[PDB]
């Protein structure tokens, strides 16, 4: 029932991701001068980088919001792949894979101690 635990768990699976060979192409923003038409397609920017730089910064108040800034790096991969076969786009459905199942229990643990805190 630890409301704070989720940060420490959020760092270091940001820490897990990092280490991961298929994290690469979204550790830092997309380089507009190797894509130049992404932000024609692509409206809101996300990357590893800047979500470790939020929840360093203590700017995210739940896992949830964290969660949803991760799963932004995903569907914009998607959007922006001219193939589901595409090799960038292959690695962040392994890279979701991997992201789902280690978040799936700090979200759980987060809303079942906010949950005790207001019983
Ligand atoms: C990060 N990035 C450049 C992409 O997500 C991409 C997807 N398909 N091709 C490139």
């Given at each position: 029932y630890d409301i704070q635990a989720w940060k420490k768990?959020?760092?270091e699976l940001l820490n897990l991701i990092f280490?991961?060979?298929?994290?690469?192409?979204?550790?830092?923003?997309?380089?507009?001068?190797?894509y130049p038409d992404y932000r024609?397609?692509?409206?809101?920017?996300?990357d590893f980088a800047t979500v470790r730089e939020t929840l360093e910064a203590g700017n995210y108040?739940?896992?949830m919001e964290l969660?949803?800034?991760?799963?932004?790096?995903?569907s914009n991969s998607?959007?922006?792949?001219p193939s589901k076969r595409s090799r960038i786009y292959?690695?962040?459905?392994?890279?979701?894979?991997?992201?789902?199942?280690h978040i799936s229990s700090v979200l759980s643990d987060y809303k079942s101690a906010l949950r005790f805190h207001k019983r």
């Open positions: 768990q959020c760092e280490q991961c060979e298929d994290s690469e192409p979204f550790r830092q923003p997309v380089d507009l001068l190797e024609d397609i692509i409206d809101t920017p996300m108040e739940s896992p969660c949803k800034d991760v799963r932004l790096i995903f998607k959007a922006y792949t292959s690695m962040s459905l392994r890279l979701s894979a991997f992201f789902e199942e």
